[PDB]
Design a protein around this nucleic acid. Structure first.
Ligand SMILES: [K+]
Ligand SMILES: [K+]
Ligand SMILES: [K+]
Ligand SMILES: [Mg+2]
Ligand SMILES: [Mg+2]
Ligand SMILES: [Mg+2]
Ligand SMILES: [Mg+2]
Ligand SMILES: [Mg+2]
Ligand SMILES: [Mg+2]
Ligand SMILES: [Mg+2]
Ligand SMILES: [Mg+2]
Ligand SMILES: [Mg+2]
Ligand SMILES: [Mg+2]
Ligand SMILES: [Mg+2]
Ligand SMILES: [Mg+2]
Ligand SMILES: [Mg+2]
Ligand code: NA
Ligand code: NA
Ligand code: NA
Ligand code: NA
Lengths: 41, 203, 144, 208, 88, 213
RNA sequence: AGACCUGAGUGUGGCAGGACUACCCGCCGAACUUAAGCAUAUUACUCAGCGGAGGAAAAGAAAACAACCGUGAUUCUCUCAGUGAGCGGCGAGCGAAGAGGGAACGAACUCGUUGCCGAAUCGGGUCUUACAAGGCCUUGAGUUGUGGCAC
RNA sequence: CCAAAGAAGGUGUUAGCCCAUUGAGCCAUAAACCUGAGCGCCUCAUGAACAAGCGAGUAGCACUGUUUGGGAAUGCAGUGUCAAGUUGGCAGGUAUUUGUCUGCCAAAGUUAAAUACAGAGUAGGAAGACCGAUAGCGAACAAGUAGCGUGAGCGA
């Protein structure tokens, strides 16, 4: 919110989170490393 | 997206890994209640295809139904009248088991609106269907143009009237044209317009 | 109307034309078409021969529209020509045009003697109709 | 006695007649004139409500679909996207402007497509598009005089602008040509019918 | 493009003459299906079919596939898929 | 459909010395054991109860009804048939009676009255006025309290100009383009007294045609 | 220590049970009767029974018809048609559909998926004259995915 | 004598003019409805112009049962068995194996009208070639009452 409020008058580099976004990052070969939880139910 | 992987994996129910997962799940479901409330659906891809959304006011329940043919509930298995009606063990219920599970869910919790359901597992004795239900009083539901149709009282207990997908299935409404002419808009509607005597004024 | 029926004439006759011996009882022959082979056999056989049994090939899902094929004969063609046109018609001259399918006919049959020479547009024509109308100065033009 | 009568099949066996024990299954038409009057009054009310828009939307001309009915014409459901685009119209815009739109009809030939394109052009040239704002008119819209002139198309079939459906014209009289005065039409027709009828058997014989 | 009709009621191109208008792969899904199939292995039906094809009983494999699947086209396609799979 | 049959009403059988008709069940009531369900029984069901799908309406061939209207009009052109029907036309100038179209400009019932007296239609209107009475029999209990004769019928070219003739008792109004056989031959009897305006009269040739046109 | 995730307790805010039930929707479901007997059939996918809604319901936007010069969601009416359809101890009996004329008709939209984004979403407090389709705040819910855009 | 009113009710016998009734028209209006998508202010939203895919214990198939005019099986149900992927599926009313053609794209969902009201209700209306106190609803009346039955019910 602060960044957008400042820009009115992109985001810093970060991990990719979420199953949809992470899957897309893998499919497009944009991920350099992928960390997967072992206990998803 | 990831949906494709989940959907393909759920097209492989007879593989060893899916059979292992389903065996563990079916044992656990065996030791639970006939009706169970779930925080999240077991098959998110299927649930979302059927209209489930990860929103306030959306609920998922797992309903268990017993397998087998219907036993005709006559005293001591004795029937009367013509031999044509004398069968006790070989008749089949004219509703499917998914519709039955939806009806049991809807009857039990009358404050909810049943939306849809899907298959999740089955035993030799049991079948488990997860029913999707909506709270019609939640503000999130009432202010959503995608789902607030179900707030209107014509959709109260729509599963009791065969109006969900499973009910439509056993009503024959998956077919159109010449494969469904005697059952549209319903069997009774077609019987009414095929069997009533018309008296034109000048005849 | 009720006043013209035999009931009015029968008021006071007690039996209303059905007799003292044989009464007017409920169903003394059975209901409807009962016993067409047992005790009504003579009636069925002498007035409705052919009623019992089977014959021929089945045709499931009979659609009558693909089979629509009405006919008109040569000596009836004047039904389809305007009154003034039939007179300005003659062999060797300019002839009226009849389009059959718009008049409700599919086949030109060809019974009788043709009265007005004309050009006929037909989906079908019998061989005798075609030859007979060509001898009279007309023609058949196929159409669909 | 029975005598010589038709064998009866009246089919009144089911409990159709209402009585002390049966609800019956009947449909009488005693409300027919009241319902006709109601329908007419409703049409008049709806025309009053939507003035000056025509009561019936614009519909295309189509060909009836069997060998029994293909010489006939009638009004179709809606104009196809190809006819609308050929007429220079967006289907959403045509839907808002009084034109029925049908995305299912496939436009198999040129004659039907062209007749419907002409219906669209005739409608569009006589259309009087009222402005959203009377004080700021945009291109294609009406002015004060045209909007004031108005007039409502109250036709049963909503085609007072394009006219009734058009049939092909009856042929004029002519002479029998020499080819027509020599040839056997029967033999030609028969041979074509036989070519289709015996196609499989001729193929199986010639291929043996 | 379609052949024009002859203008008469019978025959090979029968019909009323109009000027006719002409009639107006899944690689990523294949990739997903391949990954999932490698992940899960063979259905027991596929195992039985592969055993049949290994010992040279192509006919028995086709009959087994027809019985389980209920359709001859699907049975043939499944037998071909198992042949291609055993070739890897 | 339930009238006369709203009872349990079983037959007692032949054991007892009574008739075999069904009888109302129960006790403690004057109708306990009474005959039931039968057309001959008090409180029972009528024989062959009336239905609503009786044929109330008739279809008549279009040509036959046009023929009937034409015959009725020709009959009205005959003074002898008109008086035989019961109209008082012994003072009227001509039959068929044709008047000027200006009566369509009347606004008061008084002017229409003066016009009826002028062309001597007032005698038939008076016959109708004096015939007024209470209907004999049950029809007066129904919404049919009064009866009267028909009287003259004035045919207009259109629906306008009838303002001053509406309240005249014993004067019927008609529109030339929708002429009715029930009014041209009341009771099925031809010979109605018809007063034509000029404009309606000149329209009869195109409405009904000629023997050749 | 603590976390989530499975499940409890209580507080707070709300909803369901009952009535009606003519018509309508889902199930369940006879027998008398007809066949001059009777068992298939018929009565009847009816009555009785168990559920559910409305002002109508249900249906409804083609895995539709057709086989044409082609039609074009649904429903309803005439007709198709008591049918040279068909079903049937092929007996008694039963029995529709497409096309055609019409009523209606501003009739069409949403999700899921795909791919481009990725909390832009929801709820709750609190300001704007405002349990705003608004602003501010908020870990509360939501990344095990809500919401936007596109054919 | 009135009538743009003759239209039926009331009044001690049969009423246009004894009475009531109605026509133009007058007054008052929570909200909702209709009206250049009626008309302003604030707020908020908003239009115009500067490449891949498509719904799985699903569809099929086998047996059984049922339903249908649907006949080597019209729909449905139980159980077993269970796909394909637009080089694809479904349908095309005689089963099969081939190969052509045509239409369409199932297995989430919403939707007004035209239709029903075959023993319903609420508020108003209009009628009848119907019945006329053993008729017509059981009930023209303190009638679902009095009375009867342990009761379900029966019922003047
Ligand atoms: K008998
Ligand atoms: K039509
Ligand atoms: K009396
Ligand atoms: Mg006898
Ligand atoms: Mg019948
Ligand atoms: Mg009864
Ligand atoms: Mg009575
Ligand atoms: Mg029985
Ligand atoms: Mg009976
Ligand atoms: Mg017996
Ligand atoms: Mg019942
Ligand atoms: Mg509805
Ligand atoms: Mg299955
Ligand atoms: Mg719905
Ligand atoms: Mg008395
Ligand atoms: Mg009485
Ligand atoms: Na309730
Ligand atoms: Na209700
Ligand atoms: Na009076
Ligand atoms: Na099944």
């Amino acid at each position: 919110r602060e960044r957008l409020q400042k820009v009115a008058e992109k985001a810093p580099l970060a991990v990719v989170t979420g199953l949809q976004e992470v899957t897309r990052a893998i499919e497009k070969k944009q991920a350099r490393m992928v960390v997967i939880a072992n206990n998803v139910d | 997206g990831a949906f494709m992987y989940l959907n393909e994996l759920w097209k492989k129910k007879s593989s060893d890994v899916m059979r292992f997962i389903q065996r563990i799940r079916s044992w656990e479901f065996r030791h639970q209640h006939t009706v169970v409330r779930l925080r999240r659906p077991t098959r998110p891809e299927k649930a979302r295809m059927l209209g489930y959304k990860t929103k306030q006011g959306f609920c998922v329940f797992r309903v268990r139904v017993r397998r087998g043919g219907r036993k005709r509930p006559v005293h001591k298995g004795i029937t009367y009248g013509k031999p044509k009606t004398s069968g006790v063990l070989g008749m089949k219920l004219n509703k499917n088991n998914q519709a039955v599970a939806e009806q049991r869910l809807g009857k039990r919790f009358g404050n909810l609106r049943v939306l849809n359901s899907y298959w999740v597992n089955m035993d030799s004795t049991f079948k488990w269907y997860e029913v999707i239900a909506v709270d019609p009083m939640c503000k999130t539901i009432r202010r959503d143009p995608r789902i607030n149709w179900i707030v209107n009282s014509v959709h109260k207990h729509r599963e009791q009237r065969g109006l969900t997908s499973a009910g439509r299935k056993h009503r024959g409404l998956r077919h159109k044209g010449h494969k469904a002419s005697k059952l549209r808009p319903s069997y009774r509607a077609a019987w009414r317009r095929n069997n009533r005597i018309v008296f034109l004024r000048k005849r | 109307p009720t006043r013209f029926k035999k009931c009015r004439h029968q008021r006071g006759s007690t039996f209303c034309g059905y007799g003292r011996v044989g009464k007017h009882r409920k169903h003394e022959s059975g209901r409807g078409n009962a016993g067409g082979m047992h005790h009504h056999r003579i009636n069925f056989d002498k007035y409705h021969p052919g009623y019992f049994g089977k014959l021929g090939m089945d045709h499931y899902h009979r659609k009558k529209n693909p089979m629509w094929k009405p006919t008109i004969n040569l000596n009836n063609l004047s039904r389809l020509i305007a009154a003034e046109e039939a007179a300005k018609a003659a062999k060797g001259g300019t002839l009226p045009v009849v389009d059959l399918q718009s008049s409700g006919y599919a086949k030109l049959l060809g019974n009788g003697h043709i009265q007005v020479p004309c050009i006929v547009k037909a989906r079908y024509v019998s061989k005798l109709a075609d030859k007979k109308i060509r001898k009279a100065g007309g023609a058949v033009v196929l159409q669909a | 006695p029975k005598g010589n009568n038709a064998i009866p099949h009246v089919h009144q066996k089911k409990h159709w007649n209402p009585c002390s024990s049966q609800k019956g299954n009947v449909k009488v038409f005693l409300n027919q004139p009241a319902q006709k009057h109601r329908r007419r009054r409703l049409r008049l009310l709806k025309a009053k409500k939507v003035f000056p828009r025509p009561l019936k939307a614009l519909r295309p001309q189509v060909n009836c679909p069997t060998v029994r009915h293909n010489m006939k014409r009638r009004l179709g459901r809606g104009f196809s996207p190809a006819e609308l685009k050929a007429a220079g119209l967006n289907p959403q815009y045509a839907a808002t402007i009084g034109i029925r739109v049908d995305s299912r009809r496939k436009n198999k030939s040129e004659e039907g497509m062209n007749v419907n394109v002409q219906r669209l052009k005739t409608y569009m040239s006589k259309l009087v598009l009222f402005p959203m704002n009377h004080k700021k008119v945009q291109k294609g819209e009406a002015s004060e005089e045209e909007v004031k002139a108005a007039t409502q198309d109250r036709s049963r079939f909503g085609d007072a602008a394009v006219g009734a459906v058009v049939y092909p014209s009856a042929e004029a009289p002519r002479a029998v040509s020499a080819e027509e005065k020599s040839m056997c039409v029967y033999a030609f027709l028969k041979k074509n019918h036989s070519a289709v009828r015996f196609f499989g058997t001729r193929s199986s014989r010639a291929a043996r | 493009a379609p052949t024009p009709r002859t203008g008469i009621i019978a025959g090979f191109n029968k019909g009323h003459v109009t000027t006719r208008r002409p009639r107006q792969p899944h690689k990523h899904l294949r990739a997903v299906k391949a990954i999932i199939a490698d992940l899960v292995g063979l259905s027991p039906l596929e195992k039985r079919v592969q055993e049949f094809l290994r010992v040279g009983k192509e006919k028995r494999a086709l009959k087994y596939c027809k019985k389980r699947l209920g359709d001859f086209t699907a049975a043939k396609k499944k037998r071909s898929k198992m042949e291609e799979a055993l070739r890897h | 459909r339930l009238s006369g049959m709203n009872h349990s009403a079983h037959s007692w059988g032949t054991g007892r010395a009574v008739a075999r008709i069904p009888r109302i069940s129960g006790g403690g009531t004057s109708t306990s054991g009474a005959g039931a369900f039968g057309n001959m029984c008090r409180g029972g069901r009528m024989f062959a109860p009336t239905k609503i799908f009786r044929r109330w309406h008739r279809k008549i061939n279009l040509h036959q009804k046009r023929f009937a209207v034409v015959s009725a009009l020709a009959a009205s052109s005959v003074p002898s048939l008109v008086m035989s029907r019961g109209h008082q036309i012994g003072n009227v100038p001509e039959v068929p009676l044709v008047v000027e179209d200006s009566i369509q400009g009347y606004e008061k019932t008084k002017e229409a009255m003066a016009f009826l007296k002028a062309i001597a239609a007032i005698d038939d209107v008076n016959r109708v006025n004096d015939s007024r009475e209470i209907r004999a029999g049950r029809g007066k209990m129904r919404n049919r309290r009064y009866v009267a004769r028909r009287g003259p019928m004035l045919v207009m070219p259109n629906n306008k100009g009838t303002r001053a003739f509406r309240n005249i008792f014993g004067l019927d109004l008609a529109n030339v383009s929708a002429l009715n056989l029930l009014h041209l031959a009341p009771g099925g009897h031809v010979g109605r007294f018809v007063i034509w305006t000029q404009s309606a009269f000149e329209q009869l040739d195109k409405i009904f045609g000629t023997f050749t046109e």
